[PDB]
Amino acid sequence: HSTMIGRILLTVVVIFRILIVAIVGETVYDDEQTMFVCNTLQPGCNQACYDRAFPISHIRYWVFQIIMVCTPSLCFITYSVHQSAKQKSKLRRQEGISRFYIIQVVFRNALEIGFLVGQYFLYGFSVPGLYECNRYPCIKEVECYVSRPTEKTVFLVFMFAVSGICVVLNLAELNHLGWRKIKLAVR
Amino acid sequence: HSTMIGRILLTVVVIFRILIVAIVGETVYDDEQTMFVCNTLQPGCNQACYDRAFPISHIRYWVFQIIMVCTPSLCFITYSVHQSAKQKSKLRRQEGISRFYIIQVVFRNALEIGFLVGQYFLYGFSVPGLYECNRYPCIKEVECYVSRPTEKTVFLVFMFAVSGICVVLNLAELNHLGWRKIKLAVR
Amino acid sequence: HSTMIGRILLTVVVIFRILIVAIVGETVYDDEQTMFVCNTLQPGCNQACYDRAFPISHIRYWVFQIIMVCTPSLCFITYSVHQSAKQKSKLRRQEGISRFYIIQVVFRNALEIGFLVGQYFLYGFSVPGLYECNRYPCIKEVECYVSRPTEKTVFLVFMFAVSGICVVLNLAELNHLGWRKIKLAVR
Amino acid sequence: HSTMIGRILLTVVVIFRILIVAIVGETVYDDEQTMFVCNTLQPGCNQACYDRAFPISHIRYWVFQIIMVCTPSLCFITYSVHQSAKQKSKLRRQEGISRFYIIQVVFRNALEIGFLVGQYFLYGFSVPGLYECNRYPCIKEVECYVSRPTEKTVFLVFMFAVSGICVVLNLAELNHLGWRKIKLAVR
Amino acid sequence: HSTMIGRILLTVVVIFRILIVAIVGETVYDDEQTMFVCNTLQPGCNQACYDRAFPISHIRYWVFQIIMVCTPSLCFITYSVHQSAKQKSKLRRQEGISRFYIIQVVFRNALEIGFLVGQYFLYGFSVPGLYECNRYPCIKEVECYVSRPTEKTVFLVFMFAVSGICVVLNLAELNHLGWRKIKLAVR
Amino acid sequence: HSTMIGRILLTVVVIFRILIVAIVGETVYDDEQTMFVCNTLQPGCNQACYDRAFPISHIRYWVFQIIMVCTPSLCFITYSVHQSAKQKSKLRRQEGISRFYIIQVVFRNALEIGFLVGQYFLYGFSVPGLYECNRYPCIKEVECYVSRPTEKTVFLVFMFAVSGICVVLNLAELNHLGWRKIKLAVR
Numbered sequence A, B, C, D, E, F: 001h002s003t004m005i006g007r008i009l010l011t012v013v014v015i016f017r018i019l020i021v022a023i024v025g026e027t028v029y030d031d032e033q034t035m036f037v038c039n040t041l042q043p044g045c046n047q048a049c050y051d052r053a054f055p056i057s058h059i060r061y062w063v064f065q066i067i068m069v070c071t072p073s074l075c076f077i078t079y080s081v082h083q084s085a086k087q088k089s090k091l092r093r094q095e096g097i098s099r100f101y102i103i104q105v106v107f108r109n110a111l112e113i114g115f116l117v118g119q120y121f122l123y124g125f126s127v128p129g130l131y132e133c134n135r136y137p138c139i140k141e142v143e144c145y146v147s148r149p150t151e152k153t154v155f156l157v158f159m160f161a162v163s164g165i166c167v168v169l170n171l172a173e174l175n176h177l178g179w180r181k182i183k184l185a186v187r
């Protein structure tokens, strides 16, 4: 019950997060590297420490996740276009399209779960403003400073909450589908 | 009475504020971090003080509020599209759409009130040109300077006035709806 | 007489000024703050003096005026769309639309007059290349220098001339309307 | 004779110059102020000398000329739209449109001549790489250096040649019109 | 078997990689040259070492490969447009179009193989964070440092994996075509 | 024979080169002036040497050539639009259009040959990474260094190869036309 409104809410949340990231994410991380001050005098002790502290920026991971999530929708649209171009057998084709969509949404749920787990394990919750690094160029351990940690961690928490809401909606959709539909999709 | 003209005025104000922010807000806060001068010599005493003075910039909050306000309209549009795709029962569907729109506008009023309260409590009215900060990197209290405070506080006051006008229009719409419509929406 | 050609000329002037500002204004004021040199050594004596000399930049005022001027046109378009969606009474509706447009153009003339008066009182005619400032951060009076004053004052004079031409055209339209139409709009 | 092909060539040249300027002009003058080196030590001796050497940049004048030239075409299009909306009298209206277009093209030729004369008198042909300036901030005469003079003067010469070609085409069109058409337009 | 779904998946992968690169590649390599620190004091020892370490950036090669891959599709579209404009002979024309498409896809597979081999031989897998260079401007061997190596090598590995998947799909399509179709295309 | 496929290939090559330049050329030459290091201490010895080494950048010449090449196509399109608006005489008009197109393609071949000769004579093949300059501001001969020479010369070689391919295709088209068509176009 209430499946269509749930799908509508999920689409609204997807559009909301896509617009929010495409508007704000570029500006926050536009000059992250430039605003890096570290207590050191050895040349090259700054770039190595910045790479160690932030190997992959959060914006790249978010963009990658958003682009990867939309691929089943794109392939479904292409398959529907091909089916329309091609045209008792119609009912069989409709059933095949339905089971294809079911498998697509299951794969989308799996991808969302994997992306959420990876984001949780990689970045975490809070962004440390102060970092301690010791690589080959730096003779001893040095203390570097990060710029704007509060905004980064707040936006990361918001992204995690949005991903959790999407996961909950996807689980609700899977529960609406149910064991019989899962078994039918398997066979 | 005069409900349609009030809704037209509200839409005009929304378009006005959206265009104004999308035109001017990026340029004002484009290089806020760069134009930061503080009386200190300790490395890292500038970024921490800037983060303390401005944890979240006003432009991010305004963009977030604008994007959040438009979500009920987007979900209503999607629901209308779904209803059109699906098509005595028509009258019942129209009544359901009407009560859905009523609940949507009530939620929009609540969200606007919450956003206005948060903006008032977080930023306030005036932006202090001079700041005094004392964090761990800075040994003692230091005096930092902010660039272009007058423009920031003027634009913040204008945004507050626009939000107040929108709140007044929303309250007028709720009064036009009235207790009977609220009770019907509840049940 | 010659009312339609006057309105056409006014629209042409509006499009001309909008295109001119949207093309040139961003580049002139793109790096105004960076090109600021002042004879001082006290930290923070530059930002405060720049804020004192230029509290609100001319481009922001021009953009605000242009956006505010177009609001009656937008509300008229929305009202016309609503009237078209809704559809002896037709003649009454047409008369109401005509008087609404008359009131709208009167309000537009008033807004243009107010904006012109504010621009004249705030900025003036010439931009002083050399400024003398004495605020709290600066111990004594200091002499700061402004970059590209000639272009700024020339473009300000051109904007003032365009606003004057628009005001003259609006006054001509009001004279064409006349006392009888004003009295009819009042009642 | 060969009037239509001449008008086609004029339109092609206008599109060519518009595309060329809109593509290249922004990049050449993007950082003209930054690449300014002058043999001086007095603060403020650089901005004043740059303003004296280049009061108005060539790109602003070219953009202003291009925008001003297109205004008669825009007003003619608006008048044609109004005439279409409004609809022996048709022949009179067509004759009025023809004489209006004749007056418009005469005004366009006059504006082009004035703009060409102003460009010739203001900028000239060659851009001096070395400048000598002596204003109030600079105690004595100082020698400043300009960046990329050859490209600026080459593009200025090309713009002058394009303007001359346009003037020649406009004069050919005026000769095709002739004394009888000029007299008819006058009365 | 499963040829159409394979082509759909290949198109989806192409769109995915195109969007991913067009979104992320510009920002990563936006300021690669600026963030270059090398242990040297001789002027010109930095630019030569940067050129030696990175003669051609990865983004240029990826853009070139993507643009080159799409050329057979563009020429096929143009040929189809010409055939549509031009219109037992229809069957012969369809067979000619089919064999033209077969030759086009064979050429596309060859181009993809060549581009993959070139990318593997030129860049490799890992980006060395530390480089040792000795050119004419630098008296002796000097040690330069690269900024953000981990992101560059991760994205390069992802691009290599995407190219491998595309190559596998193209080989599957060629196997579906088969020896008989290859022989028919040859003659 | 094979004229239509040759024209299709020429159009494909034109689109390919236009897309390639519009994508990559801006980024390569975005900050050429900034990354200029020369062994000198006299102020103004850098800008003059940079102007001497690179009077006109390659990107400007390429953009100018591309824009100039497309002008006959634009004028042909405008002439076709005029002919369509205007409408035994039809056959004569078609023959006139054909001979006009022949003259247009001959002029395009001549322009391409001239542009190729100019590019070969001006820039050459290789970009010298090291330059020796001696102008008035510099007391003696000084050694300046160029940034990213390998990419510039590689892209220049690619542009030369593309221009050569276009010239070969144009010569093939002219050979297909032949002496009889040339004589008919002359008279």
Ligand SMILES: CC(C)CCC[C@@H](C)[C@H]1CC[C@H]2[C@@H]3CC=C4C[C@@H](OC(=O)CCC(=O)O)CC[C@]4(C)[C@H]3CC[C@]12C
Pocket: A125, A126, A157, A160, A161, A164, A165, A168
């Ligand atoms: C659809 C519903 C289920 C969404 C619920 C969202 C939660 C997954 C999010 C929302 C707010 C989050 C919390 C916001 C703030 C914090 C404080 C934060 O504390 C620190 O960063 C310091 C201590 C530490 O290192 O853990 C730990 C995570 C936590 C509890 C977060 C855990 C995850 C929460 C509960």
Ligand SMILES: CC(C)CCC[C@@H](C)[C@H]1CC[C@H]2[C@@H]3CC=C4C[C@@H](OC(=O)CCC(=O)O)CC[C@]4(C)[C@H]3CC[C@]12C
Pocket: B125, B126, B157, B160, B161, B164, B165, B168
């Ligand atoms: C639809 C209608 C009801 C909109 C009305 C808008 C008001 C909510 C705004 C418009 C102008 C605002 C005022 C503009 C200027 C100031 C001065 C300002 O003073 C300071 O910043 C220094 C003193 C202090 O710290 O409070 C205090 C807020 C106040 C009164 C503002 C309070 C809120 C006002 C009345």
Ligand SMILES: CC(C)CCC[C@@H](C)[C@H]1CC[C@H]2[C@@H]3CC=C4C[C@@H](OC(=O)CCC(=O)O)CC[C@]4(C)[C@H]3CC[C@]12C
Pocket: C125, C126, C157, C160, C161, C164, C165, C168
């Ligand atoms: C439709 C018609 C009526 C438009 C007419 C436009 C005028 C309103 C503008 C056009 C040119 C302007 C003038 C251009 C130059 C100057 C010099 C300027 O002198 C200075 O800046 C130094 C002296 C001082 O401080 O006043 C004073 C304003 C004035 C006369 C301007 C006054 C306003 C003028 C007449």
Ligand SMILES: CC(C)CCC[C@@H](C)[C@H]1CC[C@H]2[C@@H]3CC=C4C[C@@H](OC(=O)CCC(=O)O)CC[C@]4(C)[C@H]3CC[C@]12C
Pocket: D125, D126, D157, D160, D161, D164, D165, D168
């Ligand atoms: C449609 C036809 C008539 C267009 C013809 C274009 C001319 C108006 C242009 C094209 C090339 C120009 C010439 C190109 C180069 C120079 C050298 C230039 O010499 C200098 O800059 C140094 C000497 C000085 O200070 O005059 C003087 C202008 C001149 C002759 C230019 C004069 C104007 C010319 C002839």
Ligand SMILES: CC(C)CCC[C@@H](C)[C@H]1CC[C@H]2[C@@H]3CC=C4C[C@@H](OC(=O)CCC(=O)O)CC[C@]4(C)[C@H]3CC[C@]12C
Pocket: E125, E126, E157, E160, E161, E164, E165, E168
């Ligand atoms: C459609 C299927 C067949 C795609 C398979 C993709 C492979 C071509 C890619 C995916 C992951 C890649 C591997 C990811 C990581 C590494 C570690 C890497 O190690 C180093 O960089 C250090 C040692 C060295 O210098 O080789 C060597 C390449 C390798 C094995 C890569 C080899 C190529 C792999 C297997």
Ligand SMILES: CC(C)CCC[C@@H](C)[C@H]1CC[C@H]2[C@@H]3CC=C4C[C@@H](OC(=O)CCC(=O)O)CC[C@]4(C)[C@H]3CC[C@]12C
Pocket: F125, F126, F157, F160, F161, F164, F165, F168
């Ligand atoms: C449609 C077909 C005919 C296109 C053929 C393209 C040629 C016009 C291009 C492609 C590769 C080019 C060559 C690539 C590399 C070089 C090395 C280059 O050597 C140097 O830069 C150092 C020596 C010197 O100063 O000449 C001289 C030009 C040359 C032979 C180029 C000459 C022109 C070539 C043959």
Ligand SMILES: CCCCCCCCCCCCO[C@@H]1O[C@H](CO)[C@@H](O[C@H]2O[C@H](CO)[C@@H](O)[C@H](O)[C@H]2O)[C@H](O)[C@H]1O
Pocket: A053, A114, A115, A117, A118, A119, A121, A122, A123, A124, A125, A126, A127
């Ligand atoms: C699509 C699916 C993708 C799956 C992705 C799986 C990625 C797995 C990454 C394994 C990384 C192991 O290395 C891991 O590094 C991270 C961050 O660098 C460390 O993380 C630590 O520092 C970061 C900040 O730097 C803190 O936010 C975090 O709370 C803390 O645990 C982990 O303690 C360590 O375990």
Ligand SMILES: CCCCCCCCCCCCO[C@@H]1O[C@H](CO)[C@@H](O[C@H]2O[C@H](CO)[C@@H](O)[C@H](O)[C@H]2O)[C@H](O)[C@H]1O
Pocket: B053, B114, B115, B117, B118, B119, B121, B122, B123, B124, B125, B126, B127
């Ligand atoms: C969508 C709904 C969102 C609800 C949002 C609720 C946000 C609540 C934030 C609680 C913050 C508590 O911390 C609060 O910090 C702000 C600004 O940092 C302080 O604010 C103080 O400094 C700021 C500038 O920095 C001044 O403009 C302000 O007038 C002054 O009160 C408050 O004195 C303090 O109470």
Ligand SMILES: CCCCCCCCCCCCO[C@@H]1O[C@H](CO)[C@@H](O[C@H]2O[C@H](CO)[C@@H](O)[C@H](O)[C@H]2O)[C@H](O)[C@H]1O
Pocket: C053, C114, C115, C117, C118, C119, C121, C122, C123, C124, C125, C126, C127
């Ligand atoms: C939509 C309607 C808006 C109405 C706007 C009304 C704005 C009123 C602003 C009142 C400002 C009072 O402060 C006013 O500051 C301006 C500029 O800062 C001063 O202006 C002075 O300096 C400026 C440059 O800085 C010169 O160009 C000007 O000629 C000179 O008078 C005035 O002498 C002073 O009176």
Ligand SMILES: CCCCCCCCCCCCO[C@@H]1O[C@H](CO)[C@@H](O[C@H]2O[C@H](CO)[C@@H](O)[C@H](O)[C@H]2O)[C@H](O)[C@H]1O
Pocket: D053, D114, D115, D117, D118, D119, D121, D122, D123, D124, D125, D126, D127
């Ligand atoms: C739409 C029509 C517009 C009409 C525009 C009329 C503008 C008239 C400007 C009058 C300017 C008088 O001041 C004029 O300055 C210019 C450039 O600043 C000087 O010009 C001098 O220097 C410039 C470079 O700086 C050289 O390129 C030029 O060859 C040389 O003559 C003139 O010698 C002087 O006469």
Ligand SMILES: CCCCCCCCCCCCO[C@@H]1O[C@H](CO)[C@@H](O[C@H]2O[C@H](CO)[C@@H](O)[C@H](O)[C@H]2O)[C@H](O)[C@H]1O
Pocket: E053, E114, E115, E117, E118, E119, E121, E122, E123, E124, E125, E126, E127
């Ligand atoms: C469309 C088809 C294009 C075909 C392209 C063919 C390009 C062939 C390039 C030949 C280059 C020979 O020079 C080649 O330089 C590369 C990188 O510069 C060196 O590569 C070496 O350094 C790079 C980084 O700099 C490492 O990532 C790599 O693992 C290592 O081998 C090779 O050891 C050397 O053989």
Ligand SMILES: CCCCCCCCCCCCO[C@@H]1O[C@H](CO)[C@@H](O[C@H]2O[C@H](CO)[C@@H](O)[C@H](O)[C@H]2O)[C@H](O)[C@H]1O
Pocket: F053, F114, F115, F117, F118, F119, F121, F122, F123, F124, F125, F126, F127
């Ligand atoms: C549309 C048609 C356009 C026709 C264009 C005709 C342009 C003619 C330019 C004549 C220039 C004469 O000056 C010419 O300068 C170039 C480059 O500046 C010199 O060129 C020299 O240096 C350049 C780099 O700077 C090398 O790449 C080149 O191999 C070498 O010959 C020539 O040796 C000299 O002859």
